[PDB]
Amino acid sequence: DVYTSIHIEEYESEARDTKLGPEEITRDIPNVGEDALRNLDDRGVIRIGAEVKDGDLLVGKVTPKGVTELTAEERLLHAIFGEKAREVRDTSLRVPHGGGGIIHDVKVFNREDGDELPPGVNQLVRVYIVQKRKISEGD
């Protein structure tokens, strides 16, 4: 007996071409939790019906970096790890703590399907989160 509906969130995420000469979209989220990738598939995207939490981008977007861009720490790290490691930038989407809702729907467009895209973009994917709210019980 209340006048209120459910809200609908809309997130954006497109693979922007880097100035270092990109080739394809990849997923590289270092220092990430296992829970954030507990639903993520081999494609690098979270499946539908999965909740949302802080630090969970729910999307794998990272472009290649340059050579000089590296830091002195990476130079010495060579002897630490024994072998150089590819370095990229985190261009994925940022997700707030809690999220408010849950991943119930997700739209993803691919050029291979025949969908035209703007200049500088390689892919397009949006997330849909439904806000859930319930009255207060106990008082």
Swiss-Prot record:
TM ranges: none
Quaternary organization: RNAP is composed of a core of 2 alpha, a beta and a beta' subunit. The core is associated with a delta subunit, and at least one of epsilon or omega. When a sigma factor is associated with the core the holoenzyme is formed, which can initiate transcription.
Family indicated by similarity: Belongs to the RNA polymerase beta chain family.
Purpose: DNA-dependent RNA polymerase catalyzes the transcription of DNA into RNA using the four ribonucleoside triphosphates as substrates.
Protein's UniProt name: DNA-directed RNA polymerase subunit beta
Top-level taxonomy: Bacteria, Bacillati, Bacillota, Bacilli, Bacillales
Residues of the full protein shown: 785 to 923 of 1193
